[PDB]
Write a protein that binds this ligand. Structure first.
Ligand SMILES: Cc1ccc(C(=O)Nc2cccc(C(F)(F)F)c2)cc1Nc1nc(-c2cccnc2)nc2nn(C)cc12
Length: 277
């Protein structure tokens, strides 16, 4: 019971499952309603789950209840006393950030995009300081609310190679510093409205390019300071990367002195259009 110390136990009569929207480790994820009524996402642990699955499922519920931060998905509660067991979270209206960006190409101001990134960074700083290494930080794992607030989540699946730091790929060293690398990729995803990192390079081509010193080029219309910051997230030497504390501080200062974002990094045009004279 102590694992659930930060969670609220929800009675099953409060929950209505409506539509399957995903899979858990041993069960489905549903959109549903929770009693006023509010929409929720509901992850179940169905009959037949193993001991390890139960420990991991209740452990997930417990840590999610512990997290209380504006930029982390909110746990409404847990059903642990009845079967199927359930983890119940808020339901974001705008869905996942990657799809959202791609469906809203060019619709936001630079300040709005940078504000998104500040929120993601604040959530990640909180996770890191709570001793939680995400390991799968990517725009697909971030939800967006109707105030444009980004909420770090984890929707499950092995290694998303092109979001993952070299040391995590090479020797399985996952830390908050490998999450910083991933955050740099997320910065690039946001500023490009959901372009796929490294385009059609294979996983092996990405790893070879990184090891040889190549890095993603600047997004179009990207503030110089923002490109500089994402580039420092991609230092090979893990110790040279900013901490999330540094990232949050820098993004907050840029937003609060917004003229700092008017200077743009040079975009390298991959195609040349010459209007004849
Ligand atoms: C039910 C549920 C359970 C666990 C999680 C989840 O984010 N877990 C988790 C685990 C470890 C660490 C973290 C965290 F640190 F926050 F990133 C989060 C999310 C959810 N909520 C979900 N919401 C949604 C969703 C979809 C559209 C709009 N709003 C929510 N989709 C989900 N798919 N899956 C597999 C889970 C979804």
């Amino acid at each position: 019971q102590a694992v659930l110390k930060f969670t609220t136990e929800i009675h099953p009569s409060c929950v209505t499952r409506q539509k399957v929207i995903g899979a858990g480790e041993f069960g489905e994820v549903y959109k549903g309603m929770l009693k006023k009524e509010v929409p929720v996402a509901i992850k179940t642990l169905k009959a037949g789950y193993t001991e390890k699955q139960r420990v991991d499922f209740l452990g997930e519920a417990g840590i999610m209840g512990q997290f209380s931060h504006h930029n982390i998905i909110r746990l409404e509660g847990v059903i642990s006393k009845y079967k199927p067991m359930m983890i119940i979270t808020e339901y974001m209206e705008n869905g996942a950030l990657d799809k959202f960006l791609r469906e809203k190409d060019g619709e936001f101001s630079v300040l709005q995009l940078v504000g998104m990134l500040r929120g993601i960074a604040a959530g990640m700083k909180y996770l890191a300081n709570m001793n939680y290494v995400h390991r799968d930080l990517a725009a697909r794992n971030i939800l967006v609310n109707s105030n444009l607030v980004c909420k770090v989540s984890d929707f499950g699946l092995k290694i998303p190679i092109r979001w993952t730091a070299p040391e995590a790929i090479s020797y399985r060293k996952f830390t908050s510093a490998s999450d910083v690398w991933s955050f740099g990729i997320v910065m690039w995803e946001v500023m490009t409205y959901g372009e796929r990192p490294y385009w059609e390079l294979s996983n092996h081509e990405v790893m070879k390019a990184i090891n040889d010193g190549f890095r993603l080029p600047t997004p179009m219309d990207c503030p110089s300071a923002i490109y500089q910051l994402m580039m420092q997230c991609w230092q090979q030497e893990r110790a040279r990367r900013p901490k999330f504390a540094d990232i949050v501080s820098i993004l907050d200062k840029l937003i609060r002195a917004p003229d700092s974002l008017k200077t743009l990094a040079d975009f390298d045009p991959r195609v040349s259009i010459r209007l004849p004279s």
